[PDB]
Amino acid sequence: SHMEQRILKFLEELGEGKATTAHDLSGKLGTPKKEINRVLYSLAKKGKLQKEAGTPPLWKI
Amino acid sequence: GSHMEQRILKFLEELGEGKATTAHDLSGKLGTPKKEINRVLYSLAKKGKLQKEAGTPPLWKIAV
Amino acid sequence: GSHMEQRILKFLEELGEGKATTAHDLSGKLGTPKKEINRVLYSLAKKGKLQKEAGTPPLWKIAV
Amino acid sequence: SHMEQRILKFLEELGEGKATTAHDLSGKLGTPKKEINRVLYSLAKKGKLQKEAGTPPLWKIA
DNA sequence: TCGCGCGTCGCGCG
DNA sequence: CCGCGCGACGCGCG
């Protein structure tokens, strides 16, 4: 998918143990946050992304 | 100056030259409430160290 | 807006006294998206016009 | 709500065509101004209070 | 033209 | 124990 790959490549250009927030990616890609989270949690359903607790939640691998 | 000032200053510097960011962003990356960040941000602008461009939210960068 | 506020308040009136209904129910009866239904519900609660009871889903009744 | 009554009764005692400021209500009632305003704008939500422009804004009963 | 109310928001939910 | 309202907000204020 489109958002899926954008979000993946971005994370790789951040680091391995590095994680970011949805809101961050929302402004770093100019796409609505409700949308980022939708694709974030979706990528989780595929084992491509790992979510780590917090408010807001953090996203990596 | 204080701890918060130095912290925010080194942060903005390590972004480039004509780069900017928001209080919200700093609040998250410094693990500090946003009211405090804004307290220091506007204070630094009063010392000519920081420059603020309009917007909602406002953007912040090093003063030229 | 204050249109829905009436459609709902009126629907809640006929519901009797002390009888609470859900947002999902209203969504059907009023042919309105649950989201807009909830927006107005929580808004009215703030206006002290509506009272909300715990549960899943939450129940809604005329306040006081 | 506990505050809403206090503020209302005061604006009732004030007068119909009369308007006071949040900064004043804060002083009379001994309530931090933030709370006064917090309630003021809330009461304006419920159509109980009417706000008319100015710096500071003026407040009266609907 | 100090006006200020302002809290959190975590939300992924189909 | 799907609960979801969620956007307004720019706020720094002594």
Residue D49, CB, less than 7 Å from strand E?
A: no
Tokens in use for A49? 């992304």
* Burial class of residue C52, CB neighbours in 10 A (0-12, 13-18, 19+): middle
C:D CB pairs within 8 Å: 7
Apex C19 CA angle, C15 and C23, nearest 5: 80
Helices and strands, counts by H and E, chain D: 3, 2
Q: Which residues contact C22 (CB under 8 A, 6 or more apart)?
A: C57, C58, C59, C60
Torsion, Cα of D10, D11, D16, D22 (10° steps):
140
Q: Cα separation of D60 and B14, whole Å? A: 52
Q: Are A15 and A54 in contact (CB under 8 A)?
A: no
* C38 φ, ψ (degrees, to nearest 5): -65, -40
B25 contacts chain A (CB < 8 A): yes
CA angle (B9 as vertex; B45, B59 as ends), nearest 5: 55
A21 touches chain B (CB under 8 A): yes
Distance C56 CA to E5 C1' (A): 32
SS3 C30: coil
**CA nearest A23 in B: which residue?**
B25
| CA gap A22, A37 in Å, rounded | 6
The residue range of the domain holding A38 is 1-61
The 3-state DSSP class for residue A53 equals: coil
What one-character-per-residue DSSP string does chain B give? --HHHHHHHHHHHTT-SS--B-HHHHHHHTT--HHHHHHHHHHHHTTTSEEEE-SSS-EEEE--
> Under 8 Å CB-to-CB from D50, ≥6 apart: which residues?
D44, D59, D60, D61, D62
Please check whether residue A44 is in contact with residue A50, taking contact to mean a CB–CB distance below 8 angstroms.
yes
Using DSSP's 3-state secondary structure scheme, residue C53 falls into: strand
**Among B31, B20, D6, D45, which residue's Cα sits nearest to residue B7?**
B31
Cis check: omega of the bond before A32, within 30 degrees of 0: no
**Which of these, B62, A30, C51, A46, lies nearest to D1 by C-alpha position?**
C51
Q: Which residues contact B50 (CB under 8 A, 6 or more apart)?
A: B12, B41, B44, B60, B61, B62, B63
CATH code of the domain covering residue B1: 1.10.10.10
Looking up tokens 């003021």 gives D40
* B21 vs B6: CA distance, rounded Å: 16
Are A19 and A25 in contact, with CB atoms under 8 Å apart? Answer: no
Q: Which nucleotide is nearest to C35 (CA to C1')?
A: F5
> Any chain C CB within 8 A of the CB of D46?
yes
Nearest residue, CA→C1' of E10? A55
Task: Quote the number of domains for chain C.
Answer: 1
E strands present in D1-62: 49-52, 58-61
Any atom of strand E under 7 A from CB of A5? no
